[PDB]
């Protein structure tokens, strides 16, 4: 074992990248400087390197952790500045990390305790919304997912349709994700821009066990209507879901 030890070397910032960090630290408190043509060049170095390191599918958690540590040692303001840069799609490292199921890196970002986890990308979605649909295979990962849910607003509504993370999870029949969202305070009575609830999404898609889980929520209101007056019960009938429909009638009236 020890004679066969393979040391992983620390990753270190390039000269140009460390220079950009030091430049940013001195102008972080001068908004005029930050807005200048010349300073856009250093900001470009920052964003290009950081996204290359943090946000590819193949991203190395040890490299991201070394970078976080190096930024921190330049300045905590530099660390919080870089961690929350968004590219031209409005995506942060936390959006890409989550999307890739790179949960070690998600864990690193949350642990910096400088991450804004409620940031909407250009598509209009938060990292929690992306997480609702991200592949998860080990239980160690679902713990990071639940940390992410805990650290931000699970009740945010997306710019397109006002959908919620709970609605996205319901619509994919992701019971594991519905449970974690519920456990972290997702409100089941939020309505999207058309008046739909998660209960209605579950009736549309026929997810019987999700319907049970939503109805098991203490304040769940099965009487809400969408903009057209449709109810969860009426939707279940229209979509041909006779057993969901009986479940819903029985809960409204027992």
């Amino acid at each position: 074992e020890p004679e066969k030890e393979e040391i992983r070397e620390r990753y270190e910032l390039s000269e140009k990248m460390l220079s950009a960090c030091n430049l940013l630290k001195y102008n972080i408190k001068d908004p005029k400087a930050l807005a200048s043509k010349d300073m856009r060049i250093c900001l470009n170095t920052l964003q290009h390197d950081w996204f290359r390191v943090s946000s590819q599918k193949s991203a190395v958690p040890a490299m991201v952790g070394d970078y976080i540590a190096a930024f921190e040692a330049v300045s905590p303001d530099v660390l919080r500045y870089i961690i929350n840069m968004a590219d031209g799609n409005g995506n942060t490292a936390l959006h890409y990390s989550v999307s890739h199921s790179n949960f070690q890196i998600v864990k690193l970002l949350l642990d910096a305790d400088v991450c804004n986890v409620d940031h909407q990308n250009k598509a209009g979605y938060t990292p929690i919304m992306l997480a609702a649909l991200a592949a998860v295979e080990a239980e160690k990962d679902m713990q990071v997912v639940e940390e992410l849910f805990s650290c931000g607003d699970v009740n945010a509504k997306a710019s397109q349709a006002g959908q919620t993370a709970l609605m996205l999870a319901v619509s994919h029949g992701r019971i594991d994700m519905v449970k974690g969202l519920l456990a972290c305070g997702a409100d089941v009575n939020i309505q999207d821009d058309e008046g739909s609830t998660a209960l209605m999404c579950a009736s549309e898609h026929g997810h019987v066990e999700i319907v049970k889980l939503l109805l098991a929520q203490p304040g769940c209101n099965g009487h809400l209507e969408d903009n057209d007056g449709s109810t969860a019960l009426s939707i279940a009938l229209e979509a041909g879901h006779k057993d969901i429909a009986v479940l819903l009638y029985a809960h409204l009236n027992f």
């Binding site: 250009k122 209009g124 996205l168 898609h205």
Partner: peptide
Amino acid sequence: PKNKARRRTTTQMELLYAD
């Protein structure tokens, strides 16, 4: 008839990128 958000099954790629 997919003319309401609740009837759609959105995509991971739709969540990450728009225009």
